[PDB]
Amino acid sequence: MKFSNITIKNFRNFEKVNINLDNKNVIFGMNDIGKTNFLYALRFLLDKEIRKFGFNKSDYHKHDTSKKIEIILTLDLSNYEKDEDTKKLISVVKGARTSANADVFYIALESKYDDKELYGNIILKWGSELDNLIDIPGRGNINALDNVFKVIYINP
Amino acid sequence: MKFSNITIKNFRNFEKVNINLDNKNVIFGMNDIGKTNFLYALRFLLDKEIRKFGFNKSDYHKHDTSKKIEIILTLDLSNYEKDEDTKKLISVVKGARTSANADVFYIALESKYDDKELYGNIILKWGSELDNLIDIPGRGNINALDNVFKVIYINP
């Protein structure tokens, strides 16, 4: 598969940033805070060690305005017709894609507002279409996405 | 509501320990490790900040023998017939208790084997009877038992 794009609808430093993606991505620039918050957004979407802590009040654009954090990722689930990797790639999930002829896949994140109980409540949803998004099945503490993607973080 | 008993089927220091319970409990003795492991078992049951870390390899009786941790707490859900706290105590849950004339309530903890993937995977289930225990619905990172019990831990 091949990553297509990422949209961050709200974060601690982002307002409506949409970045097209691929494999072997390289990020640079003047703003170090934006790069480290992009990497923290990737950790929040793709790792359990940052997901289990929840969202804190300081991780918003304004600390009380527009309390709705959405981080969307696209997967491009379809492979070539000469390679049989499509069925092995699809068969990890069953009910996410309604039709077998779908082209792309979505992974989304949703944050409950921090007005009451002062806690983030990370909710993970996937699905083949943006409308009628469905939850990720977690039978205990480990959800179904954690068996698919393993994130190894390297920092000197 | 009045605690009845606690059963620890396996822990880092317990084998077949069953302790009767009540409110306003005082624990003392020569063995400090048993007291702190009893308190840690209570923290693993009713506090989320220790529940979210899962179980390690060292939290077993022997490090490869009898990998089945069960911690059972009895609740005594029924109250007196002249006080209307019974309905307000029952109405936090709906599908756990099959009959309205049920007397006792169970809260159980289950830990998967640590042989594969090196993680504990805490599974929590409650129910009015010991058999056919149903899972607590956790829609995000917070289950329904979190809104019931608030644990305040004091240690200088």
Task: Report which secondary-structure segment, H or E, holds B38.
Answer: helix B32-46
DSSP state letters, A81-108: TT-THHHHHHTT-SSS-SSTT----EEE
Angle at A46 between CA A101 and CA A55, to 5 degrees: 125
State the greatest distance between any 2 C-alpha atoms of chain A, in Å, as a whole number. Answer: 53
CA distance A97 to chain B (A): 21
The set of residues, in sequence order, having a beta carbon less than 8 Å from that of B87 and lying 6+ positions away, is: none
Structure tokens at B89: 């105590």
Residue to test with chain B: of A56, A123, A141, A147, most B Cβ within 10 A: A141
- CA-nearest residue of chain A to B109? A140
CA torsion angle for B94, B100, B105, B108 (degrees, to 10)?
-40
The amino acid sitting at B33 is I
CA distance A64 to chain B (A): 22
Are B139 and A139 an interchain contact pair (Cβ–Cβ within 8 Å)? no
Distance CA A88, CA B148 (A): 42
**Any alpha helices (H) in A4-53, and if so which ranges?**
32-46, 48-51
Distance CA A83, CA A2 (A): 15
- Dihedrals φ, ψ of A41, to 5°? -65, -40
Structure tokens at B32: 């400090």
Are A139 and B123 an interchain contact pair (Cβ–Cβ within 8 Å)? yes
Structure tokens at A29: 């620039």
Q: For residue B125, how many C-alpha atoms fall within 13 Å in the half-sphere facing its CB?
A: 15
Distance CA A89, CA A77 (A): 7
Structure obtained using: cryo-EM
Q: Which DSSP letter does residue A138 get? A: B
For chain A, how far is it from start to end, CA to CA, in angstroms? 29
Distance CA A128, CA A23 (A): 21
- Dihedrals φ, ψ of A64, to 5°? -140, 0
Residue in B53, B54, B140 nearest the CB of A112: B140
A116 touching chain B per CB within 8 A: no
